[PDB]
Design a protein around this ligand. Structure first.
Ligand SMILES: Cc1cc2nc3c(=O)[nH]c(=O)nc-3n(C[C@H](O)[C@H](O)[C@H](O)COP(=O)(O)O)c2cc1C
Ligand code: SF4
Ligand code: SF4
Ligand code: SF4
Ligand code: FES
Ligand code: FES
Ligand SMILES: [K+]
Lengths: 87, 430, 42, 214, 264
């Protein structure tokens, strides 16, 4: 339930091929930018870095949780359907 | 007045406490119940609330919150919802039998008090949640309610005052936590006896989601006598802010354990040596007293010498006036065993809804059992104090407080007894 | 006017259905109940 | 001691024959009419208590029958039946002796009462006699503390007990008579022993001490 | 400021609507109050007592998940009383919590472990024996190890409100109160892996995912589900080039916090 990992913008790369090692069965790779994750304080900063380094980018906006009307007294309503049957 | 006690029988409210007269409608009418209650209901809600406020009656349930203000919390226009008065007849707390006595011996006082409180707050019904073990008491209450319904005091014309009121009796099924306000409301609503948080208060969202007020049986039953005799007389009895009469259940190591009606602010020594016949073996043989039921901590004989039976007096004595249940323990008492039995009672009666009470009261029960056996080291005394302080004030209801308080009282007063037991155990193993 | 004898002996001859029989007798004396507008909270 | 997990046994499967009598159905209707409309789920406790009073104990078929009568979830019925301690989810004897062992009863020596019951019935606490006549359990405070020590047998309170008194009560129950409730120490109720310290004079009567203007 | 009230979190002023809880005001400011039983899409329960915070000039700490801010309240979230309350509540949870962390599917995904490290004490005073609860068999999807359960009623509230089955609940009282089904009942509706999601402890784990991987080693890929035409946003958890798990993504306009059982 923690939200400390949803504070900073991240840039990652597209996933490339990971095959199986014939000797041990390990995950072998051929691209170097597989574990490359970059941290930014702003979407515009990530945009500037991506355009500066010449990489084509796909950007999705920050999904924030919608504000919710939480009421403890709704669990014990006279007529509404929000009354709970257990606790 | 500076000395309190010696209450007169002409001023005692529960005149049939001992069941020596008829408990039915004829006996209640002879004793003075249901007199001018139509005039009371016609004088209406604001006058009754003012009478309760000027009487200064506090809750007999435990907390003692001012009854006039608590009942005036529902002095609001209706928002399309019905309003309910609820009577807490559970009486789960140990040491207490007064509600049982007045239900089985003066039930018409309870019914008239339900009518008076329901009119004073504005209400269509009073639900009396009785303890499930009180089957004969519930049947006597239903007989009295049937008598009132046949006489026309209740139902579709409240004594001819053009007020509609219904009194229901609903039985529990064996839970001490169902004596709590919100857990009692849930138990009436048909779920488990788990207390709900505040806010919302029962004066806004209560039983079935209506405005409601849970009140003690003693409070409800002394309401119409307060209305008839005036609030000035009830306030004149007792001290300032601790007024009126009170039912004391004296039990334990006394010669005559009994339920008595006495004026408030009475000395504990005077009360015991007058009504209980004294401590078995004498006042010098007295060791400790739990003065307000098991929720309140214990007090030793040295402070029992001059202590009074007020809310404020016991607060100054680092205790409280709960259900006025005076449990007396002499020198022969195993004090640690008694307190551990109380903690075991709280372990069995906690509803387990919320983590501090659930886990910590189980923890205190285990630690108290090891303390009775002597099976620990004396740092665990301070550890148990810290555990009790963690439980107290962090729980949903006050059962966590009422379980942390006896441990705190035992650690505060009888700590050398604990340490002596613990070192005796250590030396008889090593 | 007797004060020396117990007078709760009516609780001695109570059976296991006394409370609910009294409730069933009392059901005819009561007012109609309020409705929440729903037959159940579901 | 008890477990709050149901196990399917031939005597407690959800096919044991339970059904309310027509009188019990009338009582259920009275309870539902006592509660407000749209809140018939509040009638779980009285209907379950009525089922227990009809059947003795409370089998899972009876609990499901209560659920389907009240149109409430069977899990809500199970929650109530497992939360509340007066509901017998296992068969009990004809007489269910409950000895209170909370602190004031312990001070007034309920331990001797428990020991004498154990020696008289030949059983330990929590178990039933082989003739299915007596179940003996320990309980918390039953609300009659000034009459300690005390037991509850079915719906009756037997108070101010001595070992001889509880032996006489057990003998009367074995013979099949009613032992009559109340204290056995000679006092009628919670009054002080050896005379009354209060309420000695007759009550004043109606219209005494009434304030003016009422 | 029409129909708005000013409150303070650590002295910082913030406008809130009436009915806003203390926890909601704190997360509006930007601090996440610790929680175990509160879920923003479930009903308010208020039982774990982990969201206890101190209001200024108030002697009793209040539960932020249920108490609404009144007016001008200064919520001292990082006060001594709040820290002591959090330490005590975590001590009470871990007193009877079982030492099952290496054999737990909730290895690095444990809210209990993380909130222990962030707010609880670093040692135990529990010298007694821990309780143990027998396990259940509610289905081949959700594996139940109920000894780890901390009785937060999140699964019960989810099944009552969102799944709409009314099958789970608490049986018993006190320390013996057990979450589950009283009878041997198989809890299989759709949207039934979300109890595995919202169970903070590893009491309700995924049986296909049982003993397979760890959250720190699983890589997260944000993708879309194609099992139906809802288009639920998901995370594919892949370790060493193999798809290991499917989790939901928070998208308030499509699937909120949950995915179907077929999707999962
Ligand atoms: C665990 C617990 C048990 C209680 N049991 C009772 C009880 O059996 N009877 C009672 O009248 N009050 C009981 N109370 C106190 C109630 O809160 C109180 O009686 C109720 O709010 C009515 O208030 P009053 O004292 O003004 O009438 C209990 C409180 C707690 C915390
Ligand atoms: S304090 Fe104890 S009895 Fe009260 S709600 Fe919490 S668990 Fe239940
Ligand atoms: S739920 Fe968390 S604290 Fe409990 S055993 Fe699993 S990892 Fe450990
Ligand atoms: S099983 Fe999990 S979600 Fe359910 S009450 Fe227990 S800890 Fe909470
Ligand atoms: S303590 Fe035994 S009846 Fe109350
Ligand atoms: S998060 Fe508020 S008490 Fe659980
Ligand atoms: K989980």
């Amino acid at each position: 339930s923690g939200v400390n990992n949803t504070k900073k913008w991240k840039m990652e790369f597209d996933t490339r091929e990971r095959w199986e090692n014939p000797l041990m069965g390990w995950a072998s790779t051929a691209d170097p930018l597989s574990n490359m994750v970059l941290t930014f304080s702003a979407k515009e900063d990530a945009i500037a870095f991506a355009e500066k380094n010449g990489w084509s980018y796909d950007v999705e906006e920050k999904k924030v949780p919608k504000p919710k009307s939480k009421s403890y007294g709704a669990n014990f309503s006279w007529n509404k359907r929000t009354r709970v049957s257990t606790k | 007045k500076t000395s309190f006690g010696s209450l007169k029988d002409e001023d005692r409210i529960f005149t049939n406490l001992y069941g020596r007269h008829d408990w039915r409608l004829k006996g209640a009418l002879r004793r003075g119940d249901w007199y001018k209650t139509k005039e009371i209901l016609l004088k209406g809600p604001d006058w009754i609330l003012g009478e309760m406020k000027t009487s200064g009656l506090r809750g007999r349930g435990g907390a003692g919150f001012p009854t006039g203000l608590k009942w005036s919390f529902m002095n609001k226009p209706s928002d399309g919802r019905p309003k309910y008065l609820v009577v807490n007849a559970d009486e789960g707390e140990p040491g207490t039998c007064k509600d049982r006595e007045i239900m089985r011996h003066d039930p018409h006082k309870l019914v008239e008090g339900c009518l008076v409180g329901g009119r004073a707050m504005g209400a269509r019904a009073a639900y009396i949640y009785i303890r499930g073990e009180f089957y004969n008491e519930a049947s006597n209450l239903q007989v009295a309610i049937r008598e009132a319904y046949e006489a026309g005091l209740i139902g579709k014309n409240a004594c001819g005052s053009d007020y509609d009121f219904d009194v229901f009796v609903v039985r529990g099924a064996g839970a001490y936590i169902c004596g709590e306000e919100t857990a009692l409301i849930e138990s009436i609503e048909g779920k488990q006896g788990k207390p709900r948080l505040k806010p919302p208060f029962p004066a806004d969202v209560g039983v079935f989601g209506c405005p409601t007020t849970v009140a003690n049986v003693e409070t409800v039953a002394v309401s119409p006598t307060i209305c008839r005799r005036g609030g000035t007389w009830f306030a004149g009895f007792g001290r300032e802010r601790n007024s009126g009469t009170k039912l004391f259940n004296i039990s334990g190591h006394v010669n005559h354990p009994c339920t008595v009606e006495e004026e408030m602010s009475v000395p504990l020594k005077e009360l015991i040596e007058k009504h209980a016949g004294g401590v078995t073996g004498g006042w010098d043989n007295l060791l400790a007293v739990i003065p307000g039921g098991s929720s309140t901590p214990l007090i030793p004989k040295s402070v029992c010498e001059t202590v009074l039976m007020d809310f404020d007096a016991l607060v100054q004595a680092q205790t409280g006036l709960g259900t006025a249940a005076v449990i007396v323990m002499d020198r022969s008492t195993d004090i640690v065993k008694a307190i551990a039995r109380l903690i075991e009672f709280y372990k069995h009666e906690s509803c387990g809804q919320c983590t501090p009470c659930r886990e910590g009261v189980d923890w205190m029960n285990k630690v108290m059992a090891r303390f009775v056996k002597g099976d620990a080291r004396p740092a665990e005394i301070d550890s148990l104090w810290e555990i009790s302080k963690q439980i107290e004030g962090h729980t949903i209801c006050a059962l966590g407080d009422g379980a942390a308080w006896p441990v705190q009282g035992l650690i505060r007063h009888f700590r050398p007894e604990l340490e002596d037991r613990m070192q005796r155990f250590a030396q008889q193993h090593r | 006017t007797d004060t020396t004898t117990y007078k709760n002996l009516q609780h001695h001859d109570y059976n296991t259905y006394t409370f609910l029989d009294l409730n069933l007798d009392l059901s005819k004396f009561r007012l109609p109940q309020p409705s929440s507008g729903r037959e159940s909270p579901r | 001691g008890a477990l709050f997990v149901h196990r399917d046994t031939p005597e407690n499967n959800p096919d044991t024959p339970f059904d309310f009598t027509p009188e019990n159905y009338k009582r259920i209707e009275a309870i539902v009419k006592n509660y407000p409309e749209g809140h018939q789920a509040a009638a779980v406790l009285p209907v379950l208590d009525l089922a227990q009073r009809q059947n003795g104990w409370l089998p899972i078929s009876a609990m499901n029958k209560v659920a389907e009568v009240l149109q409430v979830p069977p899990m809500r019925v199970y929650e109530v039946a497992t939360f509340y301690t007066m509901y017998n989810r296992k068969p009990v004897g004809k007489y269910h002796i409950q000895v209170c062992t909370t602190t004031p009863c312990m001070l007034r020596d309920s331990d001797s009462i428990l020991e004498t019951l154990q020696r008289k019935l030949g059983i330990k606490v929590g178990e039933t006699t082989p003739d299915k006549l007596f179940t003996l359990i320990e309980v918390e405070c039953l609300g009659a503390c000034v009459n300690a020590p005390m037991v509850q047998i079915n719906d009756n309170y037997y108070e101010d007990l001595t070992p001889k008194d509880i032996e006489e009560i057990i003998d009367e129950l074995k013979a099949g008579k009613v032992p009559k409730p109340g204290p056995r120490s000679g006092r009628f109720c919670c009054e002080p022993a050896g005379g009354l310290t209060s309420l000695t004079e007759p009550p004043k009567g109606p219209g005494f001490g009434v304030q003016a203007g009422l | 400021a029409s129909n708005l009230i000013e409150v303070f979190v650590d002295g910082q002023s913030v406008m809130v609507e009436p009915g806003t809880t203390v926890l909601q005001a704190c997360e509006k400011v930007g601090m996440q109050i610790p929680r175990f039983c509160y879920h923003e899409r479930l009903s308010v329960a208020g039982n774990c007592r982990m969201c206890l915070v101190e209001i200024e000039k108030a002697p009793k700490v209040v539960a932020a998940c249920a108490m609404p801010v009144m007016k001008g309240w200064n919520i001292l979230t990082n006060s001594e009383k709040s820290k002591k309350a959090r330490e005590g509540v975590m001590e009470f949870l871990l007193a009877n919590h079982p030492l099952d962390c290496p054999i737990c599917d909730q290895g690095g995904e444990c809210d209990l472990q993380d909130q222990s490290m962030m707010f609880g004490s670093d040692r135990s005073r529990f010298l007694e024996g821990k309780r143990a609860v027998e396990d259940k068999n509610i289905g081949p999807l959700v594996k139940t190890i109920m000894t780890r359960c901390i009785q937060c009623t999140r699964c019960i509230r989810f099944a009552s409100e969102i799944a709409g089955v009314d099958d789970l609940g608490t049986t018993g009282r006190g320390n013996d109160m057990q979450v589950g089904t009283y009878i041997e009942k198989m809890f299989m509706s759709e949207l039934s892996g979300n109890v595995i999601d919202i169970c903070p402890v590893g009491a309700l784990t995924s049986k296909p995912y049982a003993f397979t991987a760890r959250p720190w080693e699983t890589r997260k890929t944000e993708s879309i589900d194609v099992m139906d035409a809802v288009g639920s946003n998901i995370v594919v958890s892949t370790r060493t080039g193999e798809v290991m798990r499917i989790l939901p993504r928070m998208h308030e306009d499509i699937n909120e916090e949950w995915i179907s059982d077929k999707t999962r």
